[PDB]
Amino acid sequence: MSEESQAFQRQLTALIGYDVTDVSNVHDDELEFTRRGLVTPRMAEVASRDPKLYAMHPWVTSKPLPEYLWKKIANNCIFIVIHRSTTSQTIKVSPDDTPGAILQSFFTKMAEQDFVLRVCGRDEYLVGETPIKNFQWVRHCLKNGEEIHVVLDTPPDPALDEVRKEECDRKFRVKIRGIDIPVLPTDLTVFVEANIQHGQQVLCQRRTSPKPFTEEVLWNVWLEFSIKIKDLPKGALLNLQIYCLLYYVNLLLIDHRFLLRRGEYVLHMWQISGFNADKLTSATNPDKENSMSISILLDNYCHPIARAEMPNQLRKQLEAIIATDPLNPLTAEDKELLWHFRYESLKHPKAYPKLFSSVKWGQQEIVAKTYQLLARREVWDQSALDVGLTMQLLDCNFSDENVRAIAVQKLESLEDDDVLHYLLQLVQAVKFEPYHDSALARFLLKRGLRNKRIGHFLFWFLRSEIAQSRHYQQRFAVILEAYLRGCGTAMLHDFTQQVQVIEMLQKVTLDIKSLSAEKYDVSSQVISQLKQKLENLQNSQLPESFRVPYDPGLKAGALAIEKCKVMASKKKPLWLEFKCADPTALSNETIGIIFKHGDDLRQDMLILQILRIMESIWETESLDLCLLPYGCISTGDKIGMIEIVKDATTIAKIQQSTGAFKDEVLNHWLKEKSPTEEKFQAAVERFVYSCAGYCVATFVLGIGDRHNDNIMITETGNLFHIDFGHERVPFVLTPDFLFVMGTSGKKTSPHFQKFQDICVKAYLALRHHTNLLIILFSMMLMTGMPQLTSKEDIEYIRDALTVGKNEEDAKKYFLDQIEVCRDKGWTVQFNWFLHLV
Numbered sequence: 001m002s003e004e005s006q007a008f009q010r011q012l013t014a015l016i017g018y019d020v021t022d023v024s025n026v027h028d029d030e031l032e033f034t035r036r037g038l039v040t041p042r043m044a045e046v047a048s049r050d051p052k053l054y055a056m057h058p059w060v061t062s063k064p065l066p067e068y069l070w071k072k073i074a075n076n077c078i079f080i081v082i083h084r085s086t087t088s089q090t091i092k093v094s095p096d097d098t099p100g101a102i103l104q105s106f107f108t109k110m111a112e113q114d115f116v117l118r119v120c121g122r123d124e125y126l127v128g129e130t131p132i133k134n135f136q137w138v139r140h141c142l143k144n145g146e147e148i149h150v151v152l153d154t155p156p157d158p159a160l161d162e163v164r165k166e167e168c169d170r171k172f173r174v175k176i177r178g179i180d181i182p183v184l185p186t187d188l189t190v191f192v193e194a195n196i197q198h199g200q201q202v203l204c205q206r207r208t209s210p211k212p213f214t215e216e217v218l219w220n221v222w223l224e225f226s227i228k229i230k231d232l233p234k235g236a237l238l239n240l241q242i243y244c245l246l247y248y249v250n251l252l253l254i255d256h257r258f259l260l261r262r263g264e265y266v267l268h269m270w271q272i273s274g275f276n277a278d279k280l281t282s283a284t285n286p287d288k289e290n291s292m293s294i295s296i297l298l299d300n301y302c303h304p305i306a307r308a309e310m311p312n313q314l315r316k317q318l319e320a321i322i323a324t325d326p327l328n329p330l331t332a333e334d335k336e337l338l339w340h341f342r343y344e345s346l347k348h349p350k351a352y353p354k355l356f357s358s359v360k361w362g363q364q365e366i367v368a369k370t371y372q373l374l375a376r377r378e379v380w381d382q383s384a385l386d387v388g389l390t391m392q393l394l395d396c397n398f399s400d401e402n403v404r405a406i407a408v409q410k411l412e413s414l415e416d417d418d419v420l421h422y423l424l425q426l427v428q429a430v431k432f433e434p435y436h437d438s439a440l441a442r443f444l445l446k447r448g449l450r451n452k453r454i455g456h457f458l459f460w461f462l463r464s465e466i467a468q469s470r471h472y473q474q475r476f477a478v479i480l481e482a483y484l485r486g487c488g489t490a491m492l493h494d495f496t497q498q499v500q501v502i503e504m505l506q507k508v509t510l511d512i513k514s515l516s517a518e519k520y521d522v523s524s525q526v527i528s529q530l531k532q533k534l535e536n537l538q539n540s541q542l543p544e545s546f547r548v549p550y551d552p553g554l555k556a557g558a559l560a561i562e563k564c565k566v567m568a569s570k571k572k573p574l575w576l577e578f579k580c581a582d583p584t585a586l587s588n589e590t591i592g593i594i595f596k597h598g599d600d601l602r603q604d605m606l607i608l609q610i611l612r613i614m615e616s617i618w619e620t621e622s623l624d625l626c627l628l629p630y631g632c633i634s635t636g637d638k639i640g641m642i643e644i645v646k647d648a649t650t651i652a653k654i655q656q657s658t659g660a661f662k663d664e665v666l667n668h669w670l671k672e673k674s675p676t677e678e679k680f681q682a683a684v685e686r687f688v689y690s691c692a693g694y695c696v697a698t699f700v701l702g703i704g705d706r707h708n709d710n711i712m713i714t715e716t717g718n719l720f721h722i723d724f725g726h727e728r729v730p731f732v733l734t735p736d737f738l739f740v741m742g743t744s745g746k747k748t749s750p751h752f753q754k755f756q757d758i759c760v761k762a763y764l765a766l767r768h769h770t771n772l773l774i775i776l777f778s779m780m781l782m783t784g785m786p787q788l789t790s791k792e793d794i795e796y797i798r799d800a801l802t803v804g805k806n807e808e809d810a811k812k813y814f815l816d817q818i819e820v821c822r823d824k825g826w827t828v829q830f831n832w833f834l835h836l837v
């Protein structure tokens with residue numbers, strides 16, 4: 001291995017945030033096996049991709065243009081302004097015209113074809129055989145009444161993407177020798193609980209006798225289970241837990257080579273913090289100095305893995321079972337029906353999760369029958385892709401490789417635009433995989449390597465978890481390395497630049513962070529001190545430019561140091577502004593970015609992403625709620641970036657121009673921020689729509705009860721919530737908001753009626769996607785929050801979506817929710833100030 005390759009691994013290590021060649025916290029080679037296993041998948045995808053399309057990464061969709069967007073196009077013509085260079089002309093185009101076609105109706109229309117259209121000031125390209133109405137940037141401009149400005153330039157050199165060349169029928173038993181902890185900080189008793197699990201299902205449980213809890217407790221006792229070795233399903237975990245529940249650790253009973261685990265193990269455990277994905281991890285606690293450890297012995301030898309049509313009425317019970325929601329509990333009777341009528345079940349794709357949860361994973365013969373069932377998968381293969389259904393099969397309830405692989409099989413047909421909508425959830429679902437190398441992990445690798453925008457985001461989503469998840473950083477580091485090794489030198493160089501910038505901002509944040517206090521900073525001393533620290537960086541080691549992490553198409557240049565500062569909040573985040581490093585930009589507007597240290601931004605990324613998914617759902621129903629999910633990216637441990645939405649203030653700040661509350665303050669602000677009455681009327685309309693979206697969206701997620709200071713509005717009428725990092729009211733619809741809609745005091749009016757109608761329409765559009773939302777919500781709680789109870793926490797969403805009711809009871813239910821808010825007025829808002837004292 002050339003000394004060159006070592007310098008390179010060192011580079012990857014710094015991009016990753018973890019050293020994948022570190023073998024301090026392993027007890028086998030699953031991780032190395034996986035690094036070698038992912039070489040093939042990576043190389044195959046690198047060799048399959050088109051160098052040109054990969055270089056320009058056009059962002060496209062197959063979805064039809066929504067009704068509400070055709071409205072802005074009734075002349076069947078679209079005007080593209082080509083600016084190359086210092087000259088320019090506006091060209092009318094047809095929604096079906098291809099970029100190369102409008103280049104034909106150009107070149108000849110004026111009068112060398114080695115050119116391409118690029119969005120001004122962005123690294124965004126309009127290329128490939130696709131109708132222009134099918135480009136996201138084109139739709140983004142229409143939704144915002146913006147003009148489409150493009151520049152004619154030379155295609156990027158694919159050379160810049162060069163990839164560096166690479167080079168027994170016995171019963172199961174386990175002996176628990178003992179446990180050891182360095183320091184015990186009332187003497188309690190302690191015992192060990194051993195479980196055999198599969199898909200969060202205890203097939204067998206054994207306990208040791210209780211013993212005095214001392215720094216070292218020994219048993220030397222065999223725990224014999226009823227399950228036979230031959231019966232162990234692949235992917236089963238031996239879950240070991242210490243009760244006084246204090247600590248846990250897991251060990252895959254069958255390894256990545258299909259071999260039964262054997263030998264001595266000394267496992268360092270995870271301590272419970274006073275149900276979640278972290279509990280299923282096969283990784284051990286990296287902290288060997290201060291953790292509990294448990295020693296065991298496994299002696300097990302083997303090398304395993306070597307015309308009844310339904311009566312009319314049972315069929316009704318079956319269909320009833322199938323229609324229930326993902327959270328409905330399956331009775332023993334239900335499972336027996338699903339299983340007995342296996343072949344009937346296999347004809348309803350929606351039954352797949354319920355049915356596979358009816359399998360006795362602890363019986364070799366049954367698992368075998370299950371694979372037989374899966375063999376004739378015709379119905380499933382021809383079913384229309386149902387994301388909600390595919391995801392149910394990737395959660396904690398399914399440990400079977402084959403069952404999860406057919407889920408992944410359906411994802412294979414998603415277009416890039418959809419992978420982007422679900423990427424973050426798919427990356428989180430890698431946590432439910434029992435092995436490091438898996439079909440889902442390979443799918444993320446492959447889609448990332450096929451596309452620059454997916455790879456860019458895939459990078460940050462993996463780095464965010466690697467930096468702050470001890471339970472999964474090892475598996476995610478291997479996935480990230482595999483991707484880094486095939487994205488190409490150009491991307492590699494881009495990531496390096498982003499990492500240096502954020503690494504420098506930590507240092508600045510941290511040095512600044514020492515001079516400070518809680519609730520009020522001031523310190524004209526520290527701000528003068530900030531500008532100096534930035535000035536020092538500005539010359540270098542801070543790169544000329546870098547891609548904005550949450551808006552990769554944007555290149556930030558030099559800092560506009562005079563506009564930078566430290567924000568006045570509990571945490572002392574930086575408010576940075578940069579010049580755009582693209583001269584072709586269509587403006588002089590700086591790029592604002594809030595960089596913050598001290599908080600885990602992953603809950604906010606997660607929330608924002610679900611908001612983006614709710615928007616896409618509404619799009620499929622021809623609705624636009626005008627939500628505003630601003631960029632947010634967790635970039636490292638307790639640190640990350642946030643987009644500064646331009647021309648925006650806090651709804652509280654507006655009121656503060658304390659504690660009393662006036663209804664017209666908001667309308668006055670908006671009327672005053674409007675250049676014309678026309679713009680003011682548009683702002684009023686836009687507020688109504690955005691207000692409705694946040695009311696529906698926020699209620700469903702059960703994050704509707706917010707303080708005025710966590711809600712903002714743009715001068716253009718766009719309302720939007722912020723800071724999602726973790727009497728009552730379902731959501732916020734205060735008197736001032738009502739006033740803008742022309743109502744007050746249990747009144748009504750055309751905009752207000754328009755509000756209720758949109759809300760209702762928005763609400764029921766989400767109910768047609770009830771299962772998708774439920775599975776995203778529960779996956780979110782398991783993989784993003786603390787130890788959340790499945791039974792009660794996850795059930796909230798079921799009640800909110802009012803599962804079990806028809807449309808009429810639904811409309812009524814939401815309308816009442818709007819009424820509760822009305823009755824409450826300013827009550828709730830006003831009450832928070834006192835909680836502080």
Ligand SMILES: CN(C(=O)c1cc2c(s1)-c1ccccc1OC2)c1ccccc1Cl
Binds near residue numbers: 648
């Ligand atoms: C958590 N947190 C946020 O989530 C923000 C989200 C946005 C912010 S702060 C913001 C501020 C000013 C102008 C535009 C903005 O866009 C959206 C936050 C709150 C207060 C101070 C700093 C931050 Cl990063």
